[PDB]
Known about the structure:
The PDB classes it as hydrolase/rna/dna. The entry lists the keywords CRISPR-Cas9, RNA, DNA, Complex, Nuclease, HYDROLASE-RNA-DNA complex. By secondary structure, the chain is an alpha+beta fold. It is built from 25 helices and 20 strands. It folds into 4 domains: 4-35 and 431-533, Nucleotidyltransferase, domain 5 (2-Layer Sandwich); 48-219, no CATH class; 237-402, no CATH class; 593-610 and 642-735, no CATH class. The strands form 6 sheets. It has a 6-stranded antiparallel β-sheet.
Amino acid sequence: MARILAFDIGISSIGWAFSENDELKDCGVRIFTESLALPRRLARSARKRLARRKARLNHLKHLIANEFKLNYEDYQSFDESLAKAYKGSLISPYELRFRALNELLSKQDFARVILHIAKRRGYDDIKNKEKGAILKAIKQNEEKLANYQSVGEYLYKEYFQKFKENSKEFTNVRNKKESYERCIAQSFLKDELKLIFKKQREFGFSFSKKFEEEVLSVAFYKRALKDFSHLVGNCSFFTDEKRAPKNSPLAFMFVALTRIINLLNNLKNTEGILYTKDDLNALLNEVLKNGTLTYKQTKKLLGLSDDYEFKGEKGTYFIEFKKYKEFISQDDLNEIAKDITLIKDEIKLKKALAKYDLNQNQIDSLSKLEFKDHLNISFKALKLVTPLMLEGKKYDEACNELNLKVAINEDKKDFLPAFNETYYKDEVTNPVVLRAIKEYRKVLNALLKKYGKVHKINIELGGYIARLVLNYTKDYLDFLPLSDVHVEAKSGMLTSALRHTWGFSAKDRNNHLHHAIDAVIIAYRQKVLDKIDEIFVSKPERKKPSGALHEETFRKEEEFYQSYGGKEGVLKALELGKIRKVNGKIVKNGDMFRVDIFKHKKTNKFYAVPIYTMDFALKVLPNKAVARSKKGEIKDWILMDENYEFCFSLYKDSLILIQTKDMQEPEFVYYNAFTSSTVSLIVSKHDNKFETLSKNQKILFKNANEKEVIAKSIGIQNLKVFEKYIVSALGEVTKAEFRQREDFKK
RNA sequence: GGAAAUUAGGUGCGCUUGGCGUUUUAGUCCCUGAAAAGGGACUAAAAUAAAGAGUUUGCGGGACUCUGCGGGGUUACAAUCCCCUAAAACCGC
DNA sequence: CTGTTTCTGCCAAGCGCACCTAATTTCC
DNA sequence: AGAAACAG
C-alpha cells in the first residue's frame, strides 16, 4: 500500500493524482482561475486623496468666511449648479494672482486666489538616477520661473489666453492629454501665497496674523506615513517578538560582530590563521568609533594587502551610525531607534522621544534621522546572542550554548490547517500565491476525507512557491508511518523529460485535462488515459457580490437616445437597472455576479432576473425578468409574481444541466454569462476538449473548435431541461437541493 | 534543504501625495448663420464609485478619523455568515 | 432563438513592510 | 474579462 498524492500546482489550476500499490486510483483537475488587490488599492488611494482635498478646501472656506465675514454657503454648490461666489462674469484667478503683486485685492478676489492655489498645490519635491516626465518638467519650469516674481505671474503671462504657434486657439495653462509639461514644485506655490499675503499687507489689506498662519498650514499640510508597525515581521526564535531595527546599537553591534567573527573564521578556513578576542576587539573598536571599517584598515590590522571575498572600499559600512551618535541607557537607546524607525510623523516622534531623559537639542536632532529596515531576529534574541559573540563566539556557537532553536510546529494534524494559522503566513502578501495555496489545501483535505491518511505527497510547479507548499505541508500534516521524508518535490526538467518519454508530450495541451496527466507524472499507459477520460473538471461558482458598482466612464444621456428610445427610454432603462445614475452621472453596469432563474408555473417557460454589483450595494433585490425588445425601444420587463416560482440562482461557473428541443439528451455545462439583450446563456464544456465531442454535444456546441468549446446565445425561455448542480473540489457532481431565493439585508 | 549576515537587482502588499480624464454649472476668447441653430479653444467651480460607521470622553460637532472593487475561514457550494478589519486629536458644554 | 461586434480610465514620485533572485561570509 | 448592443 504505497499511497501517493501528487499535485501539479499552477497559477490557475490544481492537477492531482492518487496512487496506491503502484496503481492509479483517482484523477482530477481543479480550475480556480494583473494583481487582484491593485485596482482596489488605486481606487482606495484616490478616494482618500480627494476626500482630504475636499475637507482641506472646506477648512479654508471656513477660514475665509470667518476672516472676511463672507458666506460659507456661497462657496458650496447648490442644486448641482455653480457656487454663488463664482457666478457672473468672472476674472480668472491667474489674472487675480498677477494683480495681487501690484494692487489691493477685493476680499472676494483674495478668497478665490487662496482657493485656486490650494486646490492644485503642486508636487512636493522632497527628494531632489533617471528622472521621469514629472521630474523633468518641474526642473524645466524652475528655470523659466527665475524670470518671474511668482508662479501666478508666470502662468498668467506665458500661457493664459496666449495663442500657440500660428493658431487662433488659446494655449493650455493646465496640463492636457498625458502631458505633464506644466508641473511646478509645490514649494514655489507656497512661496507665491506667502508673497501675495505680504504684498496685500503693503497695499492695506487687513487680516489677523493667525489667519495667514492658519491658511498656510491648512493648505499645505501633508500627513506622514500611516502607522505600519503591524507589518513588521517577527523573530525567528521568539515568534511573539517583533524584529529588531537595523539601526539600533544592538543591531549595529550584532551585525558588526557577525562580519568580523565570520571573517576571522574565514581566514582560518583559508589560511589557518587563528585570531583572538584582542584581534577582534581591535576591529570592533574601529567600528564603534566611526561606524566604518574599510578593507584597507582590516588587512593592515592583521597581515598583508590581500583580496578576500571583496567588493568596494568599506568592509563594514554603518552609514547612519555616525549620524546617530552625533545627534545624542542601553535599553532606551534600542527603544529610541525603534521609535525613529517606525514613527515617521516627526511631531509624534518628538512626543515619543520626550518620554526619555534627553534634552530638547537631542530630541530635535533625533527627530530628523531617517531609519528603516529590520533584522530577522528580535531584541530579546540579540540580548542573548550578542554577549557570547562579544567573547568571540560564532552565531551558531552562541545559539547552541544558549539552547536557542528556530521555532517550528510540533503538533501535526490529520487535515492541513488554514495557511493563515501557520508561521509561514506573514511571508506571503501576494493574493495570487495565497489563492493557489488555498485551493491546494481544499483539494488535499478533500482527498484526505475521501481516502484517509497517505504515506507520501509529491509536488511540482517561481519555484519558491513549491518549496513553500512543501515546507507548509511537512510542518503541519500527519502522515502514515512508512517504517517500524513524506513530502518530496519532483524536478521540473525530469517531469518534462518523462512527458516526452511516455508520449504525453502533446496529448491534451489545448484543454484542461493535461494538468492531470502531469500530476500522474509527478506521482511516478492506456490505463492512465482511461482514468483521465473519467475526470470531470471542477470549477467553483463565483459568488462574490462585491466589485466595481458601475463602469468608470461618465456618459451623457444622449448616448442612449438611439438605442433606448430617446428620453423616455433612458428613464425606463434607469428604472430597470440597465443603466445607473450616480451623482447625477449616467454609467453602465458593473459585473452581473448573479442571475435568478424563474419558471412560469403553467407554461414551464424560464425567465431570468439579472443581478449586478450595484443592486447588492443598494440592498434591493430586483424582481423583474428580462423581456426581449424591439430594435430601438425598451419593452416592459416581467414582474415575477405568484405566477412564477424561483428555481435557483446562477453565478459565474455554476454547474447546470441543460437540453434544448433539438438535443436528444441533456448535457452538463458550466454557466458563464447571461446576456440581457438576447435573454440567452453562454456555456462551456468542463474540460474544454474539442476532440471528445459527442454527437449530442455537437448539437449544443455547434461552433466549437480545437481551441475552445463554448456555446453562446442559447435561449433559456424554451429550454426543455434547465437544472442546477454542484461540483465538489474533486469533480464530484451532485444535484443542487432546492434553496430559497437569497435576499439582500437592510 | 535549514539558521544568521552583507551588497545589488526585482516582485507583491500597504501608505502619503501630485497631474490628468470625464460629467455638471457657468465664464473668457474666437467662428458660421438673417434668424433658427449652433461650433471650437480656454478658464473656474462642484462631482469623481452607491452608501455608511466610529471611539479617544458623558454628549455633540467636522474646520476629525475610518470602512466602501482584496484575501482568508466556513461547506451538497462559497457567500451577504466569521476573520484579516481601527484608533487618536481638536472644537463646544 | 442564434451570431457577431463593440467597448472597458490613466500616469507619476516617494515612503514603508513582506518576500524573491544573483553573488559573498559563518554554521547545521 | 465581461456587459450588451448590433445583427440575423
